[PDB]
Design a protein around this nucleic acid. Sequence first.
DNA 1: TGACTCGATA
DNA 2: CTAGCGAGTCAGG
Length: 580
Amino acid sequence: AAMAFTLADRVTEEMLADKAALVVEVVEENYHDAPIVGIAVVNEHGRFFLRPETALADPQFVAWLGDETKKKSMFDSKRAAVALKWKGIELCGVSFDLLLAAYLLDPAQGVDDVAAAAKMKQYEAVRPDEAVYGKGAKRAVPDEPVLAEHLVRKAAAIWELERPFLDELRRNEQDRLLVELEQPLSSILAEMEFAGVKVDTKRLEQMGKELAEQLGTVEQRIYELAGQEFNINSPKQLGVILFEKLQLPVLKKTKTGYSTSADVLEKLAPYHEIVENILHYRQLGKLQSTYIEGLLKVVRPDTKKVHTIFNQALTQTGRLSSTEPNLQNIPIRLEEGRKIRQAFVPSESDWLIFAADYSQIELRVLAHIAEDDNLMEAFRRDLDIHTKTAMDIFQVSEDEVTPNMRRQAKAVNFGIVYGISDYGLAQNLNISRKEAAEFIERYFESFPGVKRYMENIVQEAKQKGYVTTLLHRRRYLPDITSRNFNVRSFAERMAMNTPIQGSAADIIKKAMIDLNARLKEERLQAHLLLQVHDELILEAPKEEMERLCRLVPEVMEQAVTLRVPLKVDYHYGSTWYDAK
DNA sequence: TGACTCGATA
DNA sequence: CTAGCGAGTCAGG
Ligand SMILES: OC[C@H]1O[C@@](CO)(O[C@H]2O[C@H](CO)[C@@H](O)[C@H](O)[C@H]2O)[C@@H](O)[C@@H]1O
Ligand SMILES: [Mg+2]
């Protein structure tokens, strides 16, 4: 049965009620400076469809959109907010976002459209967006009749589902998580994405030229050492050269052939000079193809800025993800790739980049949740946690801790946060499972609180069916009861890791909200540009650096109060690279 | 187009 | 051993 609605030719007063489900449709996946193809409004007075040219040009409708007292319920309000920002229109009063609500109720459902969220409550009177717009190559905006009904059905679904979703969130003790954390954060992310980050394209282009030269040199050296030319970028062709032509030992297999991952190559390096060259080629090619070429492809030709899109409803732990471009995995470990960051610069003259990061937030969160006396004392003394761990597990004084010992203790600490595994640790440290098991046993002997925590959280996940974070985010773990060891073990590691990674996510998200409130109170021109899980990157006039040095770390350190202090380090400079 | 294998970040 | 995004090459639909 068709859904009744008014195909309005002009905006009317009954369309501007103080409570409504609103749909401002942007079909392009990347919504930056993208077209708004249609608008739908459902309220106490009925259902309406408005053509964008009409509504967005109407003074009354625009005022309604920006009126904080006129409440709107939507799905992915950030998409609409940003698309409107590019049009110079402000969207206010969004009191309910179905996408974020669905995400909080169950991140594993992968809700990506109204139909998916609705199906959670057995509501199916709305079509999936993919069904209406098509996949990708066959993607397109249908004729007005089809488009209008779809937008109205989505608005109708939002209108009907708000109550049941809010009711379940309340039962889950997630009502404040939606209203006081995720929704306000959505507006902040919208501002960050819209602002974008300025890129020194000339510098990237120069780097591209330098890499192309090096890539060619190493490429030729590889053919020379191999005695023939082949496609180095093909793990298949490479494997033939390495394990057949050059007779290198096969220390590991993938699933469809020879394994050529860096970890494998590093072990084969001593056998042939070609290996070190393959690794070098790998490094350079990664920088060239993924970063230099990737960034240059998405930088806006006019402003020279990149506008990432932070997916706020994707990760299973509560973290954000970044796309087109992903600005959360820009090189930093190796100097060569790190220089890429010199191309990220302030958007205005005489401004600087400011970066603040939490020091060991995950281990501090673990200390808090496990209430481990030894771990809490370590952070209360602000000790080097890896040296501290080495001292305890290897039973030596601080002065006796050697570099190799600290390295292994660090690997142990990573395993503890990830969900410790003798096999996983053994693989990471290139030792036997028995040896890794011994390190783990020593760790739990030194940190009995952590041991108790890991045991208890797994039992809790089994009893309740899910685990939670400090701010009540949840993750269901049905595999925790599997009778398949590998499947169950993965779930157990998730039970151990999610409260840690997730609570750290909760904390920085709250810090972002608190920070923006403080920046506004102080009327600072400084503003957020990026978030990279445990760090915040801003840009601001050089004259604001001294104030930021005190303000940002304090806001981040005070976002939440734990049993151990939170510590934030900071740096600033002329480019992202220099903010070190 | 999409399953794989690779590698970048925290 | 946790969580992401995405480029390259390859083959099964
Ligand atoms: O607008 C981001 C928001 O949209 C979803 C779908 O509801 O993802 C779409 O947009 C992303 C950014 O362009 C794409 O990476 C993704 O492929 C596309 O489906 C949500 O996942 C996200 O929260
Ligand atoms: Mg850090």
